[PDB]
Design a protein around this ligand. Structure first.
Ligand SMILES: *[C@@H]1O[C@H](CO)[C@@H](O)[C@H](O)[C@H]1NC(C)=O
Ligand SMILES: *[C@@H]1O[C@H](CO)[C@@H](O)[C@H](O)[C@H]1NC(C)=O
Ligand SMILES: *[C@@H]1O[C@H](CO)[C@@H](O)[C@H](O)[C@H]1NC(C)=O
Ligand SMILES: *[C@@H]1O[C@H](CO)[C@@H](O)[C@H](O)[C@H]1NC(C)=O
Ligand SMILES: *[C@@H]1O[C@H](CO)[C@@H](O)[C@H](O)[C@H]1NC(C)=O
Ligand SMILES: *[C@@H]1O[C@H](CO)[C@@H](O)[C@H](O)[C@H]1NC(C)=O
Lengths: 122, 106, 325, 248, 122, 106
């Protein structure tokens, strides 16, 4: 219901970072969490999804090998790791909901966090 | 890979009238696997619709989908000033859950 | 629209015996040079057949309704084949879908739909003196049609449709059987040279077609078509028409098979003890000698009950309807 | 046909090319109910009923089993137990005319709902007021049949979709319509599992000199076992013999 | 848009007559056709309507049984038949179009023809 | 059946001031199903208004209805000499639709 996001990251180019999306109670087990880039002055791009219960993370062709997805079953916190800061990697990453089931075959993004701004500096 | 192209890129122009926002895809959207999103400036997108026309919790039914095949409609029956926001599409059919380029962007 | 015929004289049907007639292939299976014994519906040898004859020589149309047995034999001795189909419908009033066979010069159509069939069914064909042609101008059989369960159509065929008087050139043999709402028609054509006599010829009938009626059927009707040189009902010329109707009864039947696969000859085991010993021996010739054929037993007239009945009535009502259990 | 005057045709006594329709894929909606797009489609059907009617794109969803709407309750009802396919494809070029084509009509209002196969052709004006209409169209009297008015430049939701509802019941006892049945080729001179026209067996096929009658498929010799069988693919009679076996 | 009709009728009393109002293309199908008596030196009287598409004609109580309305779907022409010329039947008959459909304001006579004069003579 | 009586039956001469010619009915006109007509001499009537006040194509908005219930007004800004035709009322309700008797007949 509430998915507060980590603060803006001061990451010099080439330095790795890990975002901290925080799940409310009952959020990880029932529904999947998906990550979208939301590049500055541009559209939304689907990086991938994370099912915390089964630890399964699958990524799109573009982002493969460049980003690492992890989730913590205890403390209910979602993480996204950037391998290094490439120059175009500046963005406002977002964590949102999914369904990943049969009866509900709608895998839409129910609730989105506030967002984290990564850049060369602040 | 099923690309989506939103057709009215800037039809809004601070609109005071009902709209006919559109989305079109290379291969037809199978089983209405599309959604719309409300991205108010400086904030995250909010889900507006799922399926083809199924509405959302806390979003009034004035927002109305009307699509099939190449699912293409989001119709605001009575447009409100606070409701202004770039509107996005997303297809979870075959695609790596890709989005469109936005239709109500200034 | 149905209009019934008038002035038609009625006479009781003649009784003739039909022997070694109406046998048909029991199964579609091919048999070559094998003697086969099977139990199937078959016309008994020397069977009584009701004889309805239409002879111009009032004018004697004889096409009455006949009850439909499980197996029906319909031998017709007609040179010009004036008969044009039969109505296999119990109600005949559009209550239920009914199989209809109609023969016309332009086309031949077979239908299984409900229709307001006439009480007496006939097909009218007319001739003109200035121009020589025969066509059916009257369609009594077809009336209004409601929603139909199954629809059937048949390939067009051309027939002379002209009345003839004389010795019958050919004999047409028909076997009608309905099993599980599916109707089987068996067709045979045999050349004959007899004025009204039933010849002593063995015949085997192939299955012409198989159709699903889809309803319970217990009655069938016969349609006889008239040829005419006022009002049509009052005056008509019959021509020469003879048709024989017999009812099949299930019997064990011994059938010879030739190399072609057509039945060479068949014999009825049940009528004759000699024939029954043939079927037990599995050959059409009996070897000289006494052979244990069957078992004889007497069935009973009635049923005697010899347990006395008490006047008192059992108090099951006490046990079942008691206040407290 | 128009939606109110839904046209029915009976598909009877023919094999059906179900596979080619799937191959064409000229249809936007292929929602099949009960029969599904499968081998079950390519099998025996007692009766096939085809229904055609040009409806609104938005109303295509309505004509599904257990759904309600104006078209559903006033023009063509749907069987709740419907076993069949609903196809909708765009006829925008064919069925839209410049300035609008006002020949296709629909029933906005009717006194009650309709039965699953009800064809109401009545022109009687619907009455919603205490005043009887008496054949004059006025206040409290509104004509039931209204013209949809398809336009060439309009949204696809407001563009025509030709709909050919195909009803297939699944009992299949009459079997008047059947699929191609996926006939194979001949592979004689080797032991094979043969199934010519419904009798499964094992044996080697060879040329047969026997002349079967036209109404006979398979042949049985003495002791009631299959000896020769006619494949109906090319009306060819073939002799069945067991492949080699014996003790060691 | 233009509804040329019959102009004048030379009908001796008791002799029937048929009027020939001509509908332009697209008029007959979309719109119904209405007839108005317009008796000489008197007001306008609504005789009835022809729905061409469904061939439905309904009359007022006064004119029932005395006048016949017919319309031809091919050639788009509207016809009105007078059973016989009664003495009061002299008039200037008019043909006009209204919309049966309730989704557009209708049932009011949009456009009218030139008028048909029936009399004892010319 | 509904009856109509137009009240100003005849004005012999043209003084050009606005005239509020009227129509009244036994049972109140329902949903304002009334229309006015312009019948110039020697010619057919032409529709002037429909509903209660809705104007017509090619007829200037100087012709103004102002009715409700028993719909009773057709007004003109000024009375032109040429524009002096008998004006009729016809209800288009389910009744026989019998016109009034005319309010500008010389
Ligand atoms: C004729 O048929 C009847 C059955 O209706 C049968 O009882 C009778 O034996 C047959 N033969 C003669 C000669 O009557
Ligand atoms: C000619 O034949 C036709 C068809 O049998 C028939 O209707 C017609 O009455 C005949 N005679 C004339 C003079 O046309
Ligand atoms: C046939 O179907 C029609 C269509 O609804 C129905 O009215 C009728 O009752 C059915 N039965 C018969 C015997 O006509
Ligand atoms: C045939 O009769 C049986 C009687 O048990 C009945 O149940 C069945 O519905 C009937 N069939 C038809 C097609 O009328
Ligand atoms: C099949 O019938 C023909 C006559 O048509 C006959 O000559 C032949 O001997 C029969 N038997 C065969 C081919 O085994
Ligand atoms: C089998 O198919 C071929 C090719 O379509 C055709 O020529 C042949 O007549 C078919 N056989 C039968 C019995 O229909």
């Amino acid at each position: 219901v509430q998915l507060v996001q980590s603060g803006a990251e001061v990451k010099k180019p080439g330095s790795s970072v890990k975002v901290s999306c925080k799940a409310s109670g009952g959020t990880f087990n029932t529904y999947a969490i998906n990550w979208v880039r939301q590049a500055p002055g541009q559209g939304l791009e689907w990086m991938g999804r994370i099912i915390p219960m089964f630890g399964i993370a699958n990524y799109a062709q573009k982002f493969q090998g460049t980003v690492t997805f992890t989730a913590d079953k205890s403390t209910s916190t979602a993480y996204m790791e950037l391998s290094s800061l490439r120059y175009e990697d500046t963005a406002v990453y977002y964590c949102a909901r999914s369904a990943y089931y049969s009866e509900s075959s709608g895998y839409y993004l129910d609730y989105w966090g506030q967002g984290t701004l990564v850049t060369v500096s602040s | 890979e099923i690309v989506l192209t939103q057709s009215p890129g800037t039809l809004s122009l601070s609109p005071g009238e009902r709209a006919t926002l559109s989305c079109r895809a290379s291969q037809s959207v199978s089983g209405s696997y599309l959604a719309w999103y409300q991205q108010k400036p400086g904030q995250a997108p909010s889900l507006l619709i799922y399926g083809a026309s199924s509405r959302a919790t806390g979003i009034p039914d004035r927002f109305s989908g009307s699509g099939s095949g190449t699912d293409f409609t989001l119709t605001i029956s009575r447009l409100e000033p606070e409701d202004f926001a770039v509107y996005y599409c997303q297809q979870y059919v075959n695609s790596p859950r890709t989005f469109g380029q936005g239709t109500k962007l200034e | 629209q149905c209009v019934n015929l008038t002035t038609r004289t009625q006479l009781p049907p003649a009784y003739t015996n039909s022997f070694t007639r109406g046998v048909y292939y029991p199964d579609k299976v091919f048999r070559s040079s094998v003697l086969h014994s099977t139990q199937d519906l078959f016309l008994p040898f020397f069977s009584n057949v009701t004889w309805f004859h239409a002879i111009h020589v009032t004018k004697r149309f004889d096409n009455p309704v006949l009850p439909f047995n499980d197996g029906v034999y319909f031998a017709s001795t007609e040179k010009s084949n004036i008969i044009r189909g039969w109505i296999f419908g119990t109600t005949l009033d559009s209550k239920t879908q009914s199989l209809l066979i109609v023969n016309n010069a332009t086309n031949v159509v077979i239908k299984v739909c409900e229709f307001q069939f006439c009480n007496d069914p006939f097909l009218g064909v007319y001739y003109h003196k200035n121009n020589k042609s025969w066509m059916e101008s009257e369609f009594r059989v077809y009336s209004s049609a409601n929603n139909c369960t199954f629809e059937y159509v048949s390939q067009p065929f051309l027939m002379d449709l002209e009345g003839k008087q004389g010795n019958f050139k050919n004999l047409r043999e028909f076997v009608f059987k309905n099993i599980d709402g599916y109707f089987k028609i068996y067709s045979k054509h045999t050349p004959i040279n007899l004025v009204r006599d039933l010849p002593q010829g063995f015949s085997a009938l192939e299955p012409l077609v198989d159709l699903p009626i889809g309803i319970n059927i217990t009655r069938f009707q016969t349609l006889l078509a008239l040829h005419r040189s006022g009002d049509s009902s009052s005056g008509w010329t019959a021509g020469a028409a003879a048709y024989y109707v017999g009812y099949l009864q299930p019997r064990t039947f011994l059938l010879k098979y030739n190399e072609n696969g057509t039945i060479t000859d068949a014999v009825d085991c049940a009528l004759d003890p000699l024939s029954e010993t043939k079927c037990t021996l599995k050959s059409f010739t009996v070897e000289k000698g006494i052979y244990q054929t069957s078992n004889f037993r007497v069935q009973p007239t009635e049923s005697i009950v010899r347990f006395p009945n008490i006047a008192n009535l059992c108090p099951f009502g006490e046990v079942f309807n008691a206040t407290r259990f | 046909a128009s939606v109110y005057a839904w046209n029915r045709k009976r598909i009877s006594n023919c094999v059906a090319d179900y596979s080619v329709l799937y191959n064409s894929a000229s249809f936007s909606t292929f929602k099949c109910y009960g029969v599904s797009p499968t081998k079950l489609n390519d099998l025996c059907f007692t009766n096939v009923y085809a229904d055609s009617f040009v409806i609104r794109g938005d109303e295509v969803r309505q004509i599904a089993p257990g759904q309600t709407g104006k078209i559903a309750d006033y023009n063509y009802k749907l069987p709740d137990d419907f076993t069949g396919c609903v196809i909708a494809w765009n006829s925008n070029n064919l069925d839209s005319k410049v300035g609008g084509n006002y020949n296709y009509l629909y029933r906005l209002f009717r006194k009650s709902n309709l039965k699953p196969f009800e064809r109401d052709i009545s022109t009687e004006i619907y009455q919603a007021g205490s005043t009887p209409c008496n054949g004059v169209e006025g206040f409290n009297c509104y004509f039931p049949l209204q013209s949809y008015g398809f336009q060439p430049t309009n949204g696809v939701g407001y563009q025509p979709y030709r709909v050919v509802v195909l009803s297939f019941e699944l009992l299949h006892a009459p079997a008047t319509v059947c699929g191609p049945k996926k006939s194979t080729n001949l592979v004689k001179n080797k032991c094979v599992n043969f199934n010519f026209n419904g009798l499964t067996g094992t044996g080697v096929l060879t040329e047969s000199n026997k002349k079967f009658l036209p109404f006979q498929q398979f042949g049985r010799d003495i002791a009631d076992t299959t000896d020769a069988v006619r494949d109906p693919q090319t009306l060819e009679i073939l002799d069945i013999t067991p492949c080699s076996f014996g003790g060691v």
